[PDB]
Symmetry: D3
Subunit: 201 residues, 6 copies
């Protein structure tokens, strides 16, 4: 997991010309003020008018510099009815979270040696789930109203590997002959899928 | 931080006669069922009729065996008006959390080389805070109704070192001559403090 | 990464009734013999007559018990002409590898904050590549003869999340309405994809 | 624990205008000289004429730049007769130490799930003790002459959270209503305690 | 082991005047190009016309900046007939490797509590070995033609402590009276050994 | 470094038939008694009437079960006049230590990329030194009376790789043709060296 901190605080210096290191350099401690350990960025719902029908509001180190070196971050995800936070992976963190409003089908997938088992259930207000680092998972709003969840991670920068977007809409996209071989369908089907993700999100 | 996992899942075997290891041994994977990655233990408010005026509902590995080896846990804390989650430390984890209802004065204290600085603010619904591993911190309900927060940690077993209870009500209590020297007050004052914590909580 | 070792050697006890822990318990050191630090399991090519046209020969702790606690493993991957080791992720390890024979298009994909960038090139005998933990990647045999590579990981059990198989052929498969929403295509297309992975591999 | 080193040596650059990172940047290796792996800072006793009756002489990375990245530090603590190194916590390290002269009552406190157990004994010359990261502990000179101990930590910067000073004399102090609720005594008692720590140490 | 990465990529900035940190600072991500995850440095055999009769071709972070923060590296070692990669230690990594051509006697030595056991066998093409961090080991070409192996490590900078060269040819060499006491032979024998390593390699 | 602890205490179960894991299983916490965090094993000097002229008194987890999982250990080393703690390596820990009595030449050696630099000085009572994990180092008593030092490590089981004993007296010894090639001397010289270490210490 993230390297442990070597002092109490180390607020990220996010200036575009800052020297680059693993993670982030820190602003001078003397200059951090009083408020770096607090945020209000998750107070409002994200805009669910997206192709997925969900919206992630990030609270990782990029959005909350006071988390730098501390080995934690958060996010909020809002869902339109029938919206999905699509199959995805966090490459660098375990996730733990709670549904706050509505009803979400939450699915978590084992790796090959676990038989690619799918564990899923309908998670309601106050109920929680845990997703091991690197494993594919999704949420789907099965309710008829807006749902949201609040999640936390054991990294300052868990990363998101969105499976559909990466598979079909990477920069630039994976070669069609790779995808036809991998997906066991003809070029036309792969081309249809790519056309859905050609817009970068 | 907690050792990284060496497989997808490793549900804690919490049987009283289980062999003991760092953390917990795991139940046979073949026998875990479908539901170990989920919990509903935080759906209900804790009982705030306590001397502190707060109640912690734990969701660490002892309460959620499916978190074993995954490097995360959660808790809910409910507060009566004027209730406090008193100055305390988590010896093995950074904490990250959100106020869900009400208004909480949240205070976080730097260590000696940080001048023992106190950072505090009133945290309201949807607002968040982060507390580095090992640092003293508290919350106090400044509202006139019940408040609660939901918190997460980057350990399966963060630990709680309650400062008042440990200082005055440990098992058995710290010697009075140690406390008079350390607190710079006479025996009578130390004896008064001990009398408040003689009941073990 | 994997927990560091706390002694020189700790050969995995892979008996089916062994107590379960994070990773593996160890056989009594006194009884390990001379040969646990060696293997010959990668001397022979895997069978490439598979739907993917590739075959992975594993040398993780399950196949090489002497690697237990040491934070490393290996594998060999053989490729028929036009064969692919399809888009996949190792949830718990960085991979580093070398092409030994033939010509492989090797592609490595950044996460969302890296713009899902695809980095790819044709890798020939003696040439190497590195794949950060948790990131999607693939190889495709662009040559007209059999190719193989030998790879190593900084985990005893890196895991494999095969993207096509997990997305369409998990146990049981992800719900069609989740996949239609996530992939932005009609049910018929999702059903076609599922039919290709209904056999478990 | 502290991040492992990625090279042999990395002597801390402690210049006030140095770029800030987790831990410390390093001076150019070419310029470190011969003597960075050695110190003589603990050769002399600290001044025990303090309110606590003890004096800590630090040998962390701030005082010994050659320890930077190496995951270790030291300190010496000297005690007047009846002096205490008061209840405190090291947020980022386990401590291991030896009494060198005199007789010290050494107390170590478990966390809540350990029942806040107090383990204590009189430790004499050559005898040792170990204090897990984050746990409250103290020493008290029970002898009639000066005592000292030498301690080591598995961090370059373990931190010190002094319980009395932080509880009553932080910068600025914890609110009286928080302390009256937490300590179960009236304002007058809290005000008396604060008056003892108003001087910053 | 090496600190985990806190982002996808962090290509090492190896400029001689770069600020120094544990490991390496990184070049601006925006400027890394496409090719940093690939190398061709191990395509050619090293020059075995050396006193050892072996040649190490390094592929650590100094030679492959794209490995920075990723916790892995590689090397190739080529051997003349009768050549040795002499008893040595990697202070910061476990090694895992495969013989590619020829026949190598590979020996791995336990530490004191393992009775300094020597485990050795003749390793041929395709066969593998694993060497725990910090343990002494060697390879010796027992064949009549050139051999080579390709090895990987779970560090970006494993380090090499060559035992003969360090014992007899360090900068400056270990004092003769230290070596006579340690090796239980007279000065003349130590002086003979030093004369063989006076050239720095 | 050693895996972090997942609870307050975990006293090692050192029974010969205990299940084996990375490190040690723990005795039931309920049964540990009061005294596991303390030891008196270093109160007395070791017997310096040895070929080296030094004696190591170990206080690792094998000798101090209460250190299990806590990431620290200690040792005492006593030296006859002219005695040496010979060139050796700790494979799994950084060492930090203090001379308590007498005068010791302490030498610490960089790895290859550090030019195999030797850093050495005469260390007297109260003076300290630090030795990075995996690096060769030695001490030599330059005084005319007995010296001793007390050292600590950031591992519960640092290991000791004694260079002379391992090079010449391993179990069984390294082949003579390996040593003649590696040491650049004739068989007779290697045979002389082996004869000095044929007794196992
Ligand atoms: Mn997620
Ligand atoms: Mn807390
Ligand atoms: Mn792969
Ligand atoms: Mn302390
Ligand atoms: Mn090697
Ligand atoms: Mn040593």
């Amino acid at each position: 997991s993230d390297p442990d901190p070597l002092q109490d605080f180390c607020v990220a210096d996010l200036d575009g010309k800052a020297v680059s290191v693993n993670g982030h350099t820190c602003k001078p401690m003397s200059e951090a003020g009083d408020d770096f350990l607090f945020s209000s960025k998750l107070t409002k719902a994200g805009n669910t008018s997206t192709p997925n029908g969900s919206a992630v509001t990030e609270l990782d180190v990029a959005e909350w510099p006071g988390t730098n070196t501390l080995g934690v971050s958060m996010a909020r995800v809002d869902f339109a009815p029938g919206g999905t936070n699509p199959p995805h992976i966090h490459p660098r963190a375990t996730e733990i979270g709670m549904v706050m409003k509505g009803e979400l089908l939450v699915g978590i997938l084992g790796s090959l040696d676990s038989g690619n088992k799918l564990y899923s259930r309908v998670v309601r207000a106050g109920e929680t789930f845990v997703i091991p680092r690197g494993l594919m998972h999704f949420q789907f709003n099965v309710g008829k109203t807006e749902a949201y969840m609040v999640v936390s991670f054991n990294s300052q920068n868990p990363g998101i590997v969105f499976v559909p977007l990466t598979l079909f809409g990477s920069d630039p996209p994976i070669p069609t002959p790779v995808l036809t071989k991998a997906l066991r369908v003809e070029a036309g089907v792969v081309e249809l899928l790519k056309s859905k993700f050609a817009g970068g999100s």
